[PDB]
Design goal:
- The complex is a heterotrimer of chains A (about 190), B (about 120) and C (about 110).
- Chain A is globular, with a radius of gyration of 18 Å.
- Chain A has two domains: about 130 residues, no CATH class; about 50 residues, no CATH class.
- Chain A is α+β, with helices and mostly antiparallel strands.
- In chain A, the strands form three sheets. A five-stranded antiparallel β-sheet of chain A has the order 1-3-9-4-2. Chain A has a two-stranded antiparallel ribbon with strand order 5-8. In chain A, strands 6-7 form a two-stranded antiparallel sheet.
- Chain A is about 10% helix and about 25% strand.
- The longest helix of chain A has 5 residues.
- Chain B is mainly beta.
- In chain C, strands 2, 4, 5, 6, 9, 10 and 11 form a seven-stranded mixed β-sheet that branches.
- With about 110 residues, chain C is mostly beta strands.
- Chain C is built from no helices and eleven strands.
- Chain C has a single domain, classed as Immunoglobulins (Immunoglobulin-like, Sandwich), CATH 2.60.40.10.
- Helices cover about 0% and strands about 50% of the residues of chain C.
- The chains are: A alpha+beta (about 190), B mainly beta (about 120), C mainly beta (about 110).
- Chains in contact: A-B, A-C, B-C.
- At the A-B interface, strand 6 of A face loops of B.
- The complex binds a molecule of 3 linked components (NAG-NAG-FUC), proline (4 copies) and chloride ion (2 copies).
- A molecule of 3 linked components (NAG-NAG-FUC) binds next to helix 1 of chain A.
- Chain A: It comes from Severe acute respiratory syndrome coronavirus 2 (2019-nCoV).
- Chain A: This is Spike protein S1.
- It is classed as viral protein/immune system.
- Keywords: SARS-CoV-2, antibody, germline, V-gene, receptor-binding-domain, spike, neutralisation, protection, glycosylation, valency, viral protein/immune system, viral protein, immune system, VIRAL PROTEIN-IMMUNE SYSTEM complex.
């Protein structure tokens, strides 16, 4: 049997980066050379492994994480990076072993009056641990006085929308990202 | 009630160092995006540095490797360590809180940094 | 390949009651990611508008913003004596660093 990579890359809709989707992949023969040779990928960067020398490699579990971010934020999906996304949405460990794949999806994830479907976390007290995932929606308290569920001054909703308009610069355009974390052995 | 108060500016020779402090009230520094923004006499606004609530810090290229931002959770304070100062660093320095993607709703009165010739 | 902001006009002088409009242009589409600030000389900037068209609390209603994408305007429907200042736009959610407009100075003559 074949690994369900079509369900990952060719999926109709991706998740928001703060609620990034993880799908485990095991008990399947996988064709990787087709992925690297595909010119339909703006970004295909592997860490700890040669991309070509991949079909001849066995790993226990392969986790595929997919979400949507801005073009300018793709550089944060990498080991040892800081920023809104890496700190508060999706963190990769310094010792990450795997590949990061991205492609422009302006034709899919942008609507004329803006696409407010995709969100990201703007406020969080502390950084995410590697592969941690936070989907809470509690009002972020920026001052001493508590918020008690009422937004306002010093009382900010933590999630913000991208509003992908098709006229945005590429750096503000939606890119779909797929992160393949491998479980390598001896 | 809410305010930021800069301090520590002065007159310094080139290559000298200076350290600025921003005392907050009505607002918690380590829970906010806190940035330093400067304005050269007669010129425009130039963002300098920011520190995230999570602790990440970022700098403008013109100050990278010479300026260091920090905070004091104990005294609810923001600091800017300015080293190897140059004439183009002469400016009024403001600390401000970002509440939405760069929107600085709260500012301090500033503090004046002058780098003599 | 970074985004740059231009602000026009650079300087303008008007009279009390005048309707003043200031333009900010982005070199690439940035949706509604913009803020407007007023800076009187010797004072700290004051936030007027954020997200292109959201009026800051306490800011008089005669100030308003509009535009989305590349063209943004600030509008003072009826200029007041205290309204003389420079005015800055700012690219919000900007990478790698926040960008400020070059500023628009507003004077007041007879
Ligand atoms: C992701 O999909 C592309 C394209 O899918 C094709 O179009 C869809 C609407 C649907 O009808 C699919 O069944 C089609 O295959 C895949 O690229 C195709 O690959 C096949 C062989 O594997 C080839 O015959 C087609 O010509 C290719 N189509 C294009 C447009 O190049 C791609 O393999 C899929 N990716 C994964 C990981 O499954
Ligand atoms: O994991 C998720 O939530 C994505 C969103 C669309 C369907 N699957
Ligand atoms: O940075 C690395 O380790 C290599 C080179 C770019 C893609 N991965
Ligand atoms: O940075 C960008 O805008 C896209 C995504 C990574 C490569 N090019
Ligand atoms: O305390 C407050 O909420 C207002 C906001 C601007 C300054 N003071
Ligand atoms: Cl690449
Ligand atoms: Cl530094």
């Amino acid at each position: 049997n074949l690994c369900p990579f079509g369900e990952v890359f060719n999926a109709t809709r991706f998740a928001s980066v703060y609620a990034w989707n993880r799908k485990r992949i095991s008990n399947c023969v996988a064709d990787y050379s087709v992925l690297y040779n595909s010119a339909s990928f703006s970004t295909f960067k592997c860490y700890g492994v040669s991309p070509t020398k991949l079909n001849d490699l066995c790993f226990t579990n392969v986790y595929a994480d997919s979400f949507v971010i801005r073009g300018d934020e793709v550089r944060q999906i990498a080991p040892g990076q800081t920023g809104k996304i890496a700190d508060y949405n999706y963190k990769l460990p310094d010792d990450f072993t795997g590949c990061v794949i991205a492609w422009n999806s302006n034709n899919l994830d942008s609507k004329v009056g803006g696409n407010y479907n995709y969100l990201y976390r703007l406020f969080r007290k502390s950084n995410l641990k590697p592969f941690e995932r936070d989907i809470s929606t509690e009002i972020y308290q920026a001052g001493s006085t508590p918020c008690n569920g009422v937004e306002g001054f010093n009382c900010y909703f933590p999630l913000q929308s991208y509003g992908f308009q098709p006229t945005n610069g590429v750096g503000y355009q939606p890119y779909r990202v797929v992160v393949l974390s491998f479980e390598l052995l001896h | 009630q809410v305010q930021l108060v800069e301090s520590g500016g002065g007159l310094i020779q080139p290559g000298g160092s200076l350290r600025l402090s921003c005392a907050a009230s009505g607002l918690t520094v380590n829970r906010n995006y806190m940035s330093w923004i400067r304005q050269a006499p007669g010129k425009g606004l130039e963002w300098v540095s920011v520190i995230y609530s999570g602790g990440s810090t970022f700098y403008a290229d013109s100050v990278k490797g010479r300026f260091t931002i920090s905070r004091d959770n104990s005294k609810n304070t923001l600091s800017l360590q300015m080293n190897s100062l140059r004439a183009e660093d002469t400016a009024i320095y403001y600390c401000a809180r970002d509440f939405y993607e760069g929107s600085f709703d709260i500012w301090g009165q500033g503090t004046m940094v002058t780098v003599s010739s | 390949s970074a985004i740059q902001l231009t602000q026009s006009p650079s300087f303008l002088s008007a009279s009390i009651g005048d309707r003043v409009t200031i333009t900010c242009r982005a070199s690439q589409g940035i949706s509604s990611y913009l803020a407007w600030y007023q800076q009187k000389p010797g004072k700290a900037p004051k936030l007027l508008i954020y997200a292109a068209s959201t009026l800051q609390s306490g800011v008089p209603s005669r100030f308003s913003g509009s535009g989305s994408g590349t063209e943004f305007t600030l509008t003072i429907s009826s200029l007041q004596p205290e309204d003389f200042a420079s005015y800055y736009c700012q690219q919000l959610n900007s990478y790698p660093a926040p960008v400020f407009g070059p500023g628009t100075k507003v004077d007041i003559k007879a």
